Amino acid sequence: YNKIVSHLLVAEPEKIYAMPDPTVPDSDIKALTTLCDLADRELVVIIGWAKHIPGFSTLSLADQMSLLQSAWMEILILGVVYRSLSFEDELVYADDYIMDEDQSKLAGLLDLNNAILQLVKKYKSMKLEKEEFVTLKAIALANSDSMHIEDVEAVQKLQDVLHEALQDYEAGQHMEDPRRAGKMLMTLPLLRQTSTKAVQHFYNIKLEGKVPMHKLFLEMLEAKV
Amino acid sequence: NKIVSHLLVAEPEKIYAMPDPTVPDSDIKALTTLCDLADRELVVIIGWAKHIPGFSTLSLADQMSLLQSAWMEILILGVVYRSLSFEDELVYADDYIMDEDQSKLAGLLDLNNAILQLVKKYKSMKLEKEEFVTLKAIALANSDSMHIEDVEAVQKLQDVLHEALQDYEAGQHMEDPRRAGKMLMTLPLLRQTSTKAVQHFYNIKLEGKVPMHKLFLEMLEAKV
Ligand SMILES: [Ca+2]
Numbered sequence: 001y002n003k004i005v006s007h008l009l010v011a012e013p014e015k016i017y018a019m020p021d022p023t024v025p026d027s028d029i030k031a032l033t034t035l036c037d038l039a040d041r042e043l044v045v046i047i048g049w050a051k052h053i054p055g056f057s058t059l060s061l062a063d064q065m066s067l068l069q070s071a072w073m074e075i076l077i078l079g080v081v082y083r084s085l086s087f088e089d090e091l092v093y094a095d096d097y098i099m100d101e102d103q104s105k106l107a108g109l110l111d112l113n114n115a116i117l118q119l120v121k122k123y124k125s126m127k128l129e130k131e132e133f134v135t136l137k138a139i140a141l142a143n144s145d146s147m148h149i150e151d152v153e154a155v156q157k158l159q160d161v162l163h164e165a166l167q168d169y170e171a172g173q174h175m176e177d178p179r180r181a182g183k184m185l186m187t188l189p190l191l192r193q194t195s196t197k198a199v200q201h202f203y204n205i206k207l208e209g210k211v212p213m214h215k216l217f218l219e220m221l222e223a224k225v
Numbered sequence: 226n227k228i229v230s231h232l233l234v235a236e237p238e239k240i241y242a243m244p245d246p247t248v249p250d251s252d253i254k255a256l257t258t259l260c261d262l263a264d265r266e267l268v269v270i271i272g273w274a275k276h277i278p279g280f281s282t283l284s285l286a287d288q289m290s291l292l293q294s295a296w297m298e299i300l301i302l303g304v305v306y307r308s309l310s311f312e313d314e315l316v317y318a319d320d321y322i323m324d325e326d327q328s329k330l331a332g333l334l335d336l337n338n339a340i341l342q343l344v345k346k347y348k349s350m351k352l353e354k355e356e357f358v359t360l361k362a363i364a365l366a367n368s369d370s371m372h373i374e375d376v377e378a379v380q381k382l383q384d385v386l387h388e389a390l391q392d393y394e395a396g397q398h399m400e401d402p403r404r405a406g407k408m409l410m411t412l413p414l415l416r417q418t419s420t421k422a423v424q425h426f427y428n429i430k431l432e433g434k435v436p437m438h439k440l441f442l443e444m445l446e447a448k449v
Contacts, residue, residue, distance in 0.1 A: 118369065125380075145414045147342060156349075163406055182387050185409040190369045192413040196420060 002172070004054055004165035008134040011052035013045045018097030031099075031107040032211045036202065038094060039076060040214040046075050053138045055158045063150055069223040070144035073195040075137055077116060082133045084120050091116055112201050115194040122187055131173070132184055135166045140191060199224045226396070228278055228389035232358040235276035237269045242321030255323075255331040256435045260426065262318060263300060264438040270299050277362045279382045287373055293447040294368035297419040299361055305343045306357045315340055336425050339418040346411055355397070356408055359390045364415060423448045 020034045050068060051057050057064070083092035090100050091113055104113040142158045149155055163185075170181040177183070203225045205211050206218065244258045274292060275281045281288065307316035314324050315337055328337040366382045373379055387409075394405040401407070427449045429435050430442065 114371070118371065139410075143410050143413065145342065145417070147338070159410065160403065163403055163410070167403060167406065179384065179387055179391060182391065182406060182409055183383075185406055186363075186367050186383065186387065186412070188410070189367065189412045189416040193369065193416050193420065196417060 002165050002168045004162065005131050005135055005169050007052065007054060008138055009131065011049060012130075012134055013049050016041055016045060016094060018094040020097065026106075028106050028108055029210055031103065032205060034097065035093060035107075036205075036211060036213045036217055038097070039202075040217040042076055042079070043072060043216050043220060046072055050141060053141065053158075053162075055154075055161055056141070059154055059158070060150055062148075063155065066146040066148045067141050067144045067155070069220060070146040071141040072220050073199050073224070074140045074144070074191050077119070077195055077198060078133070078137050078140060078191060081116060081119050081123060082128070082130070084117075085124055085128060087120075089117065091120075109201070112194070112197055115190075115197060119187070119190055119194060122190070126180075126183060128184075129173075131169055132166070135162060135169065136184060136188070138162050139166065139185075140188065143188070226389055226393050228386065229355050229359055229393050231276070231278055232362055233355065235273060236354075236358055237273050240265055240269060240318060242318040244321065252331050253434055255327065255333075256429060258321065259317060259331075260429075260435060260437045260441055262321065263426075264441040266300050266303070267296060267440050267444060270296055274365060277365065277382075277386075279378075279385055280365075283378055283382070284374055287375055287379060290370040290372045291365050291368045291379070293444060294370040295365040296444050297423050297448065298364045298368070298415050301340060301343070301419055301422060302357070302361050302364060302415060305340060305347060306352070306354070308341075308344045309348060309352065311344075313341065315344075333425070336418070336421055339414075339421055343411070343414055343418060346414070350404075350407060352408075353397075355393055356390070359386065359393065360408060360412070362386050363390065363409075364412065367412070420448075 016038065018034050018038045020030065024030050047068060050064070056067075059067075080091055080093055083094075084090065087098070090098050091104070092098050099107070099109075099113065101110070104110045139159070139162045142155065142162050166184065167181045170177075170184075174180045199221060203221050206213060206221060240262070242258050242262045244254065248254050271292060274288070280291075283291075304315055304317050307319075308314065311322070314322050315328070316322050323331070323333075323337065325334070328334045363383070363386045366379065366386050390408065391405045394401075394408070398404045423445060427445050430437060430445060
C-alpha cells in the first residue's frame, strides 16, 4: 500500500449538500442559484483539502493560489463525476441534487452536463476506484498549467511525486493492465475541456445578472476567464 | 518500434505561409495569411491521418468525428514542434515566424503566449521527433468526440498508440521511468490551447473582416 494514496483517502472531504430552497418553485434560476451556492461552498472545502496534498503547502502562497485558481473547476467536476459512477445518465452534483437530462435542459446546461457524462461514461468503462479518483484530483491540481507559476521546478516535483504514486498504485493493484496509469492520465484532457466549458458557461450567467453568486465563486471565475 | 517508424515516414512535407508581398503588413494580412495556411494544413492533416495504423479501418463516420475534434490540436502541435529551437517566437511556417510584437499586432498575444507555454514545456523535456509524431497520433485517437459509434475500436487505437509511446520511452529513456506519463500530461494544455484557438478564429469569422476558405470554416463550425 502506497503512503501518498492513503493520505489522500484520509484527506477526502466530507459530503456537502446542495440544499435547494423548498419555498422557491422549480425554475432555471433556482437550479443555477443552487448550483452556484454549492460550488461556492465546495470551493472552501477544496482550498482546505489542497493543504493535505503532500508537498503542496510547501509551495509559496502565490504558487498555491495560482494552481487552485487554475484547477478548482476540474476538481469540482471530478467530484461530481465520481459521485455519479453508479448512476445512469444522471449527475450527482450532491446526494440531494441529482440532475437528469430534462433538468439539465431546463437549467440551460445540456451541453455542459452531456460533457460531464462523457467523462463519467469513460470512468465507468475503466471501473475507476476511489484511490485513483483522489490521486487524479491531486494530479489535476499539480498539473494545472497556470501561467503565473514562480517556482516551476517545485511544481514539476509535485507532479512527479503524485504521478509516481499513481504508477505505484497501478503497478501493485492492477498488474493485469500495464498501461492503466497512462489510460487514467489520458482522461485529463477531457476533464480540462469540460472545466473550461463550465467556467465560460458560468461566467456568461454572471454577465446576464439574473443569478446571485457568492464572493468566492465569482473571484475564482474572474481568475480563470 | 514499428509504429513510431511508420509515423516518422508518414510525417508530411513542410508547407509555406507565402504571405502577399504586394499587400502591406497589417492585422488583417496576418490573420488572412494564417487562415489560408491553416486551410492548407488541414488538407495535409486529413491525408496524414490515413497513415496512422488502424485509423482508416474505422468507419468513415468515426474517422471524420476524430478529425473534426482533433485537427486544431494537431495543427498547434506542429507549430509547437517547429518552434522548439527558437526563443519566444512561433514558427507557424519557415517563412512565417511571429514574435511578441507581431502577435500583439495580429490580436493573438493571449493565444500565442499559450502556445509558447506549450513550447516552454517541451523544451524542458527535450521533446524528440519520435515523441512528437506519436503524441500527434495519440491526440487524434484521444480526441473525445461526442459522436463516436464504434467506441471499442477507437479505444483500441488509443491503446495501440499509447503502447508504442510506452515501448519507445521504455527503450530510449530508461533514465526516466515516467517520461511517457510526463508526455501524456502535456495533452491537457494542448487541448486547452486548441479550444482557445478555435473560439478565437470563430470570432474572427463572425467579424467578417478576414476571408476564410471553405474547409477551414467547415472544421470551425464542427468544433464550436
Ligand atoms: Ca513522409
